[PDB]
Ligand binder design. Sequence first.
Ligand SMILES: O=C(CNCc1ccccc1)Nc1scc(-c2ccccc2)c1C(=O)NCc1ccccc1
Length: 330
Amino acid sequence: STGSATTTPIDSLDDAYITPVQIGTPAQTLNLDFDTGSSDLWVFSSETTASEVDGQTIYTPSKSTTAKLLSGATWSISYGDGSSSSGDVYTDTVSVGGLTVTGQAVESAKKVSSSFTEDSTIDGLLGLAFSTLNTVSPTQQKTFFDNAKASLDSPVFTADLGYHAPGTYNFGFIDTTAYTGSITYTAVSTKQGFWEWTSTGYAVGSGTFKSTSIDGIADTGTTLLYLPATVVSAYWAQVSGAKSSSSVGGYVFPCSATLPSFTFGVGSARIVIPGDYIDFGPISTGSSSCFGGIQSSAGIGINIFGDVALKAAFVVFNGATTPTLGFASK
Ligand SMILES: O=C(CNCc1ccccc1)Nc1scc(-c2ccccc2)c1C(=O)NCc1ccccc1
């Protein structure tokens, strides 16, 4: 089997991408944030505290004839922004572009934190990291990809995120028309539960490529590109007036600037992020100070190749017995 679905930016800055997902019988369609940095499929629901729902579409398990409460199961997650959610668990039928998994754990939110409530465009997350990170207790549950993978023509999914435009998630096949040149595959460590790999270096604009190992994760659920402070300083040094602001919480730059590209290495291959991808607009409405799309990972503990990086590439998440990651230019 295979599946394909279009993924769409939630706003004009590409802060995140949402992909429609069918849950239950009859189908309830929710727009989920496909997240290769986490492993829970969780949704706003009829059980979510009413005050914490503000425009999201909810899953109502009582209206699904295939929903079954998973007895005694709960879940609870927190993310790096201090945001969180928790609730109970149903199994139900879940489909992405007709690719169907029966018995998928659907984690129904009883509580969500303010950042989720305040974002009306995201009805939940669909995790695509490794199932070792799934938070369901006392019995850990499998991701949608793990449940689907044996049925797929090939045990893979691909992310083709657009810059200020829709893109595509494919499951089970490689669309060889979606990229240029060849796909360069690179080794993955699953020890922390992520699609963790090692970039071979970087360049800023037309500058000299620096060969240096940069360990990080391919994370579709993170907006920006988080890299070591030395690398990030090298980038922003090329933008007149750019500086790290403690109060804002990262590098800001004059909105009138033209941003240079940023290149990262995948083996001997090179992925070029155009400068415009690195502009996240005014820090507050009407400001002429703009927020940078490349930021320091110093306080994170891990580098994150988030959407800023991934959207410059066609990315293969290869879930063979020994997983690997593939990157191609596009
Ligand atoms: O958690 C993820 C992937 N899920 C991102 C997500 C999606 C929707 C809503 C909320 C979050 N990736 C990882 S791995 C490690 C971190 C991290 C980040 C900051 C501090 C400590 C750990 C993050 C993460 O939270 N990414 C999103 C993010 C939020 C705020 C600031 C930077 C990055």
